C-alpha cells in the first residue's frame, strides 16, 4: 500500500525559565525513527528505529546541524509572532510545524504537506497544489507575504517532491523487513452484566499495525451507533496499536449483535459474535 514520511516540530517559549524548548520527531507511517530534544544532553538527532541506525556519521552530523538551525529559526519566530499578536513578554507560547510527503505502492509521489500553528490553532498552510498559502488570520497574512516574496512555496515543493520522497523510498527499503508488514488485529470479546436487564459487550482489537482500523457494531445486520462507546486507537508500547468498541445490550439479546473489524492486515474483515 501507500506510505508517508512526516516531521513534527514543537517549540515552546518559557519566559523566566530560560530559553525555548524544541522537540522534533520524524515518522515513516506509524513508526517513529528520529528524535531531537534541545534540553537533552546529547545535542544530537537520535535514532528511534533500528533501520535508521545504519545511516553513517555524516548523515547524523547533517541532521543534527539542520535540526539545531530549525530550532533557532523557531526561536526568533516565537519573538516575531509575539509582536504580531501584541503579546506580552511573560506568557508561554507555542509554534508547531508538520510537513511530509505521501507515496503510492509503486513509490511515486502522491502529495506534499506543510502546516504551521501558533498556540494550538492554524497559522499558515501550504495548499493542496503546493503552490499557494492559506493564512488563517491577520498576523499570518504578514508571514504569507514574506514567503511569497521569498518564493518559499517552490522551495517547499522542491523538498517535498525531491529529497522527501527519495529518502522515504530509501528508508522503506532499508527497513523493508519491518515497515512493510501488516500485523493484523488479534480479536476477542468480553461480556459483563450491568444489571439483571443489561450487559456490556466489548469488542477488542490488539497487536495491529498500521494504526488505521475500523470497529463497528451491528444489531441484526444494521449499523448501531447508539449506546456504543469507541475509544481512540492507542499505542501498546511495542510498535503495535489497540482499540475497542463496546455496546450495552438487553440481557438475552447478545446474539443479535455482531462486531465487525476492518484492517489492512486482514485477508477479509472479521465478524465477532458472543
Amino acid at each position: 500500500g501507500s506510505h508517508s514520511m512526516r516531521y513534527f516540530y514543537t517549540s515552546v517559549s518559557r519566559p523566566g525559565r530560560g530559553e525555548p524548548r524544541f522537540i522534533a520527531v520524524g515518522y515513516v507511517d506509524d513508526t517513529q525513527f528520529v528524535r531531537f530534544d534541545s534540553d537533552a544532553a546529547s545535542q544530537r538527532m537520535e535514532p528511534r528505529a533500528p533501520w535508521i541506525e545504519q545511516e553513517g556519521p555524516e548523515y547524523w552530523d547533517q541532521e543534527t546541524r539542520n535540526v539545531k538551525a530549525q530550532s533557532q529559526t523557531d526561536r526568533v519566530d516565537l519573538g516575531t509572532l509575539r509582536g504580531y499578536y501584541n503579546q506580552s513578554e511573560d506568557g508561554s507560547h507555542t509554534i508547531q510545524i508538520m510537513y511530509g510527503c505521501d507515496v503510492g505502492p509503486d513509490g511515486r509521489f502522491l502529495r506534499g504537506y506543510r502546516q504551521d500553528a501558533y498556540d494550538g490553532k492554524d497559522y499558515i498552510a501550504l495548499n493542496e497544489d503546493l503552490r499557494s498559502w492559506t493564512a488563517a488570520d491577520m498576523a499570518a497574512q504578514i508571514t504569507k507575504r514574506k514567503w511569497e516574496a521569498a518564493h518559499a512555496a517552490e522551495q517547499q515543493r522542491a523538498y517535498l517532491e525531491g529529497r522527501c520522497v527519495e529518502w522515504l523510498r530509501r528508508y522503506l527499503e532499508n527497513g523493508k523487513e519491518t515497515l512493510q508488514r501488516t500485523d493484523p488485529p488479534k480479536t476477542h470479546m468480553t461480556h459483563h452484566p450491568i444489571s439483571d436487564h443489561e450487559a456490556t459487550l466489548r469488542c477488542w482489537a490488539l497487536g495491529f499495525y498500521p494504526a488505521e482500523i475500523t470497529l463497528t457494531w451491528q444489531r441484526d445486520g444494521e449499523d448501531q451507533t447508539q449506546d456504543t462507546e469507541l475509544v481512540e486507537t492507542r499505542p501498546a508500547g511495542d510498535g503495535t496499536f489497540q482499540k475497542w468498541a463496546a455496546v450495552v445490550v438487553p440481557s438475552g439479546e447478545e446474539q443479535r449483535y455482531t462486531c465487525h473489524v476492518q484492517h489492512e492486515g486482514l485477508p477479509k474483515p472479521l465478524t465477532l459474535r458472543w
Partner: peptide
C-alpha cells in the same frame, strides 16, 4: 531527512 529549506523561511 529533514528539510533544510525551512530553516530560512522566517515568519
Amino acid at each position: 531527512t529533514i528539510a533544510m529549506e525551512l530553516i530560512r523561511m522566517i515568519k
